[PDB]
Design a protein around this ligand. Structure first.
Ligand SMILES: *[C@@H](c1c(COP(=O)(O)O)cnc(C)c1O)[C@@H]1C[C@@H](C(=O)O)CC1=N
Ligand SMILES: Cc1ncc(COP(=O)(O)O)c(/C=C2\CC(C(=O)O)=CC2=N)c1O
Lengths: 402, 402
C-alpha cells in the first residue's frame, strides 16, 4: 500500500469535499507524523488544533483503553458513573455552573445558538421567533446549514439553499459595528472567535474582547466565545479570552478537549442560561457518553500537568520572532498568539502558498494554506525548543528556496 | 459512589436537557448492563439502536485498541491509510459509488440536505434559493436548528428562534400526500425513515416504500432514506428498505455503524449526486478519522459474521407474537420489524408508560417511553432466544402486576 494507492482509493470511493495535501500518514506520536513509506514529518497543523497534547498521548490512550472494556454508550436515557465526574471536573475547571456535552464543534455551536434563542424568548423577553444572533465576518464554526448561514465565505454557503433567518453578520474587530448591531433589542447573542482560526489566524486589536464584553453586558446580549480552536492552551492560556480577563456568557470547547482520541465538545454556561432548556428539548445520541468523558478528563489533565499553556506562550514568542526575520517581498504578515500562528504569502503568479506547503512537505514539515495565501503554523504544544528550532530552519530554508 | 450520588452530581453540574430513567450504570456486556450497586439488567433500548452488536463487543474493542496506539486524527487536510479502506468496504457493502463520512447522525442528515439542495440547483436546475425538501410528520433526525425546523414535535422546536425555510411537511405513510407535494418542481428531495423510530416505531403499510421510490423517480426528486436507527440488521435486514427491495438515492447510516464505541455516521450515494460538492465545500474536523474508521469496519464485520439480521428477523417475530398475548385492556397496540418494536399503553390513573418502565427496571429490564404512552423494546441483536424469552417474561410480570 503506497501513498499513491491511498490517494487513488479515496478518490474512487470517498466524496471529493476535501482536497488534501498529497501525503498519506499511517502513524503519529507527539509532534511527529509518519507516512506509509516511513518518512517523518513535523505536524504544523495539529488537526486544526485538535491534537494540542500531541498524537496518541499515552495518558489519554490509557484512559480510553481503561474505559472501553467497561462501558462505552448508554445514551443519556440512563445515567452512568462517568458523565457526572467529568461534568464536575470541567465546570469546576472553567468556573461555570453547568456543561452541556456534545460531540463535534458545530454541534456545540448549534447548542449555543439554541440556548441564546431560548434565553432570548424566556428571559430577555423577545417576541417569539424575532430573536437575532450576530456573528463576525470571517467566522467559521462548522458546516451545518445553520453554520454556513453565518459565513461570508462563498465556498461555504453558495448552492446550499435558503439560509437560516435571524443570523446577522458584522465586520470582525469592529466595536462600533457591534454597538450598532446591539441597538436592536431583539438581538439575543453575539458569537465570536477570540482569534479567527479558519480565516487565517486573524488576531483582533488589544481591547477588542474587553469591548465586546462591555457592549454585550450593556445591551443585555449573550457573549458566546467560540474557543473550539483557540482554547485549551493553544494560544498560551486556558482560554484565549484570558489574555484580556474577559468572561463570556457561553464558552464553546471542542477539538483538543479529547486530544484527538474522540469527538467531544462542550457548552459551558451558568444556570440562568443553561436551564432555559428543559428535559427532552435538546440532545444527541453520543453526547456525554462514558468513553468520550474519560478521554476528556485525561486530555484536560494533560494540559494542566504538563504546563502546556506556558510552553505555548514562550515558544510562540520564539517562533513569531524568527518568522518576522523572513524577507517581506515574500512574507508580508506574521501574526498569532502562543502556538496558533500564521504567515501571509505574497502570491505572485509565479508561486503560492500551496507550492510552499508542497515544498515544506518535501523537507519534512506539514502545513496547509487557508483562503489561498495564508500558511498556518500550529504544532502540538508538547514541542520542545530544540524541535521548534529545527522546524524553524526547515521553514526558513524552504521560504528562501523560492 | 451510589446511584443517588450519581443522580445528584449530574443534577448539579450537567445541563437538564434529559430526564433519564433513574438507573446508574457502570458496566455493559452484550445484552446486559450493571449498575453501581451491582444489579443486572437486560438492555431493551440499545442506546437507540447504537449498540446492535451488544455492549463492548470484543472484535470492535480490539479494533479500537489496535488503532488508538498508531494514529487517531490527522484531519482530512491530509490522507491517512485507513479512511480509503473503510470507504471501499462500506461502499461495496451497500452498492453505492461513494460515501461522505461524518460523526453524528444529525450531521449525516444535514449533509444529505446540503447534497439535495446543491443537486437541485446544479443538476435539476432549480432557481437559487427555491429548493425544497419534503419531510414526513413525526420525523426525528437530530437536534440542530435545521432538524427541528422540519419537526412536528413542539418539544423539539418550541422556543428555538426562527426556523429554516424551504422544508415542507406531509403525513407519514401517505402516498397521495407525497404525490400532491411533489407537484411542485422546486422540490429537490423527500427525506424519510423506513420506520419512524422516535415517533414510536411507526411502521408504514406494505408497499409505502415502493410507492415513495416510484413517486420520487416519476417527479425527479431525491429519495433520502434515514436508516440511522432502522439500518444495520436492527429490523432484520442490512437496510429496512431491503424489505421492499427499494434503492434510495441517498442513504444515511449512523448509531450502530460503530457498535457504540465511536461516533461515526455516513452518507451513501452515487457520483451524480455526491460530486455536486466540490473540494472545500463541506467537511468536519473528526469526519473520517482513522480511529472511527477502524471501529466502523469491525462493527460492520460483526453484523455480517454473526448473522445478526436473520437473528433479529426470527427473534422479532417471537417477541411480537408474545407481546400480542398481553391484555388489550393495558396494551392497545404492538408493532415493529425485526428487533425494533414497541407497545402502546392505555393511560389510566393507575398506570402510565413511565410507571411501567420504572417497574420494568425494578424487575431487571431497561426500557424508556417515548411520546408519553409508547414503550420501545429494542435489545441488542446478539441476544439469544432463551434470553429473549426470559426478557419477555419480565415484561409479562411487569404488565400483569398492574
Ligand atoms: C473547526 C471549528 C469548528 C467546527 O468544529 P467541528 O468540525 O468538530 O464540527 C467550530 N469552531 C471553530 C473555532 C473551529 O475551528 C475547524 C476550523 C477550520 C480551519 O481551517 O481552521 C476547519 C475546521 N474543521
Ligand atoms: C433516524 C435517526 N436519524 C438521526 C438521528 C440523529 O442522530 P444523532 O443523535 O445526531 O447521532 C437519530 C437519533 C436519535 C433518535 C432517538 C429516539 O428516541 O429514537 C434519540 C436520538 N438521539 C435517529 O434515530
Amino acid at each position: 500500500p503506497t501513498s499513491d494507492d491511498i490517494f487513488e482509493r479515496e478518490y474512487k470511493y470517498g466524496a471529493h469535499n476535501y482536497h488534501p495535501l498529497p501525503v498519506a500518514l499511517e502513524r503519529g506520536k507527539g509532534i511527529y507524523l509518519w507516512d506509509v513509506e516511513g518518512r517523518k514529518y513535523f505536524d504544523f497543523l495539529s488537526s486544526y488544533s485538535a491534537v494540542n497534547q500531541g498524537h496518541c498521548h499515552p495518558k489519554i490512550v490509557n484512559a480510553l483503553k481503561s474505559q472501553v472494556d467497561k462501558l462505552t454508550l448508554t445514551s443519556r436515557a440512563f445515567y452512568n458513573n462517568v458523565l457526572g465526574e467529568y461534568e464536575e471536573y470541567i465546570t469546576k475547571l472553567f468556573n461555570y455552573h453547568k456543561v452541556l456535552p456534545m460531540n463535534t464543534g458545530v454541534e456545540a455551536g448549534e447548542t449555543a445558538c439554541k440556548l441564546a434563542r431560548k434565553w432570548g424568548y424566556t428571559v430577555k423577553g423577545i417576541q417569539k421567533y424575532k430573536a437575532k444572533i450576530v456573528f463576525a465576518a470571517g467566522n467559521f464554526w462548522g458546516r451545518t446549514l445553520s453554520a454556513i448561514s453565518s459565513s461570508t465565505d462563498p465556498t461555504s454557503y453558495d448552492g446550499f439553499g435558503p439560509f437560516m433567518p435571524g443570523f446577522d453578520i458584522i465586520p470582525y474587530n469592529d466595536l462600533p459595528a457591534l454597538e450598532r448591531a446591539l441597538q436592536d433589542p431583539n438581538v439575543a447573542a453575539f458569537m465570536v472567535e477570540p482569534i479567527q482560526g479558519e480565516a487565517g489566524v486573524v488576531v483582533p486589536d488589544p481591547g477588542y474582547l474587553m469591548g465586546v464584553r462591555e457592549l454585550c453586558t450593556r445591551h443585555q446580549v449573550l457573549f458566546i466565545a467560540d474557543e473550539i480552536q483557540t482554547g485549551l492552551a493553544r494560544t498560551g492560556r486556558w482560554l484565549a479570552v484570558d489574555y484580556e480577563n474577559v468572561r463570556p456568557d457561553i464558552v464553546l470547547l471542542g477539538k483538543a478537549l479529547s486530544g484527538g482520541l474522540y469527538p467531544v465538545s462542550a457548552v459551558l454556561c451558568d444556570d440562568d442560561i443553561m436551564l432555559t432548556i428543559k428535559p427532552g428539548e435538546h440532545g444527541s445520541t453520543y453526547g456525554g457518553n462514558p468513553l468520550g468523558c474519560r478521554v476528556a478528563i485525561a486530555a484536560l489533565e494533560v494540559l494542566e500537568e504538563e504546563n502546556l499553556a506556558e510552553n505555548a506562550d514562550k515558544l510562540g514568542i520564539i517562533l513569531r520572532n524568527e518568522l518576522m526575520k523572513l524577507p517581506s517581498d515574500v512574507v508580508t504578515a506574521v501574526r498569532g498568539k502562543g502556538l496558533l500562528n500564521a504567515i501571509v504569502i505574497k502570491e505572485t503568479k509565479d508561486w503560492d502558498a500551496w507550492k510552499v506547503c508542497l515544498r515544506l512537505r518535501d523537507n519534512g514539515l506539514l502545513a496547509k494554506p487557508t483562503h489561498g495565501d495564508i500558511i498556518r503554523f500550529a504544532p502540538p504544544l508538547v514541542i520542545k525548543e530544540d524541535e521548534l528550532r529545527e522546524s524553524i530552519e526547515i521553514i526558513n530554508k524552504t521560504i528562501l528556496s523560492f
